[PDB]
Ligand binder design. Sequence first.
Ligand SMILES: [Zn+2]
Length: 854
Amino acid sequence: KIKPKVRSTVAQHHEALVGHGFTHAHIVALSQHPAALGTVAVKYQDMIAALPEATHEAIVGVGKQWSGARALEALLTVAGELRGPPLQLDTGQLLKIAKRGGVTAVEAVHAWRNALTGAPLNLTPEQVVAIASHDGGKQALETVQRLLPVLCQAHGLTPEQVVAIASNIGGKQALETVQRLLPVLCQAHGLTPEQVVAIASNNGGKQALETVQRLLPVLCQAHGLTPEQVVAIASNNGGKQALETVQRLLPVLCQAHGLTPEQVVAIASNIGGKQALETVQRLLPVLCQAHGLTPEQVVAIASNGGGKQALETVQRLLPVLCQAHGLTPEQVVAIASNIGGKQALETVQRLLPVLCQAHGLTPEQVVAIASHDGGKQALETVQRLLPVLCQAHGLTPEQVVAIASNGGGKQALETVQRLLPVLCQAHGLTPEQVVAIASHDGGKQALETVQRLLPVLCQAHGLTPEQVVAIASHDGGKQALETVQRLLPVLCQAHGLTPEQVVAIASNGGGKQALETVQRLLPVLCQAHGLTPEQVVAIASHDGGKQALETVQRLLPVLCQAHGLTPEQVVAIASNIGGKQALETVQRLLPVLCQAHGLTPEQVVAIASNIGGKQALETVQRLLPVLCQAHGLTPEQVVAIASNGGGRPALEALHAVLTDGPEEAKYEALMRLGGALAIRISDNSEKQINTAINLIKNHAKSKGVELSEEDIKKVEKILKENPGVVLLLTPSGKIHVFPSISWSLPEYDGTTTHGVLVLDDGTQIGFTSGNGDPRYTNYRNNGHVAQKSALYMRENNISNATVYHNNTNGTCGYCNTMTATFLPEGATLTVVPPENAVANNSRAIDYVKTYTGT
DNA sequence: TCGACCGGTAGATTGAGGAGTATCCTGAC
DNA sequence: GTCAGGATACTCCTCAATCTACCGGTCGA
Ligand SMILES: [Zn+2]
């Protein structure tokens, strides 16, 4: 890595460089700019004087750039002044400016340290060191000091927005083109100034703006793309290229390869969008044909930053990680569907036989480590630090794998290694608490913040270490901890909250957002809309509480005046994870469900008042006509199966079982719903058929549904032609006919008990546990098979019957004598457990038993 | 001590998808 | 010397599903 033009000087200067502390690798890295090789070797002892505590890595980084020697010579005679009154610069910021900005940027910051920080601009030192530390920062600084008043006054741009526009490589061009294109992009094409500033704050913002001005009246009026999609495509490095290829590769990818336009937009709205689109066009048939992938898998691989490399690497390495290392294609696609998936996938190929053998891991654990945006670094750090953490700190290997299976991964793991002997000895924590803080996205920041703030929040604010650890043990606990330290004196002393409520609000995902929103909205929601602080805190004490609380502000009068809901019902809908979605969906769907589908507002509120109440409501809208017309389920049963947490998957599974499952699965699913009568006869005699039809008629009239004589004749024919057929009468009236289930009870599955009740004529009735009588819910044997048989005997005129069940644990203890309460006078009920019944507890009965009445 | 083949409510924990922030390297002129 | 495009790593916020823990009325032991 040494050029022939450089060797004749590196050989001469190696003798001088060695002895100051420079290794040969540092010499090779620094030899990119030959002029530095002398300048360091003659002045090193001086520079460490001008820049105390600047390691050799920093010196190499500064001196190896395009103007490293000049940058170091400038920092030699400029670092004295920038550490003075105007800017409070230290060594780190000086090296940050000189490494990236260069000698020109250092000189510019030196000469203009007064005007930039002075009154007319009011730039903080951080903003100056962020504008200056970029490739060509002197031009950006001059352009800012020339154009800040104009943008901040004439165009209404915040100084933070202008600094974010200038804090990029093409900062000068971006500023000088925003200043001339804001009147046009925000008046003719209808973009908000925030959209233009989001477009322009990128490495090529001038090109992106200049090409959006042309491709808004083309990619919208012809290709059918919304302005939000265009301004999300263009808001990335080199967005001009992404737009120019979406202009020509949208007809092809949406016609030949059959990609949805939203899929193409999702592919293109990334840093290297053009390259990803071109390589998808090249590699879609090959990957979907030879390597067995589906188009959705390829789109999910390519919808990521630098997805061309990930896609090509999958093409190259899929026949190897599936044939030699044993990973399945789903796992390879999961590894590669991330940022820098090429590196993760190559590192898995390299290290999977090493981590899984020398360190005791398993392929699933390695794949779970690698399936993140920094999987290569996490895997390498795990291989480095498993011998160290697991014995010098006690962390069990699953704890290390849980720490590293996150987006940070390497950072959190190194920080844990550095900070376990501190937090566990001085601040009084335990390793479990540290591993709980660190097992999140950005746990290095959380750990450092806890170390810095635990002595403060525990004395000045009155909290406790458990509360601080609960606040910190989330994604972005640094922000929640800082905002708690900032706002607890205000929230707990002005609005009337208490530290318990503030800690409950903060102990969530976006706790900083929810806490600031509560500060902003509590003097409003409890003054105009009529809520109370307890209701607002309950709305806010969830993930995304800012969204839910703002949505409540927006939709309390609309919901409470257009649809007749009470404030309590709106608050109950909102007091859940995802309450914004639930509230918006309730607004959208309350009339449709209430009128077209024959529901009530209370049923819609009950469906929506659950975690995932938007999915559970759209699913009900989609599936109610199918279930209540073909399968005979009443709307009440659908409402009660959807009014549960996670009630979309349950309803979908019920539909799948009813549509294509085996007959026994349909039978059990239909019994597990409600008041259905599952009758079966023994022979074809007239008396038995009449008894079965009589029982069916009584059950039907118990539910208030009248059976037509045609249905009676059909049932009679079915019973008179099919021996062993099962008639299952659902509450709505539909009579399912199962021709062949079994003649024996199903195997016990540990959850639902089955049972068959036999009368004196051979008629058999089916029962399962659960769904007890609502008027006997106080009893401890409500929903047990024996109680169900007792109540069935009580309702009709049956005085001698035998119920067989299949629970291997035997008869309950509660049914020991409370079952005799439900039988009428003189009634005889014989419970029979299975052959292998054993008493699993102190009171179970596992033998044939007889109960009488009272 | 003696019992749920129950259900309802509250907090907790696991997983996924989206968006924003930050740094470094290559090529062109 | 500045500018444009591409790849990789880390931190923060929102939504959905599942899991776990606790508790009650009423009857012989
Ligand atoms: Zn029982």
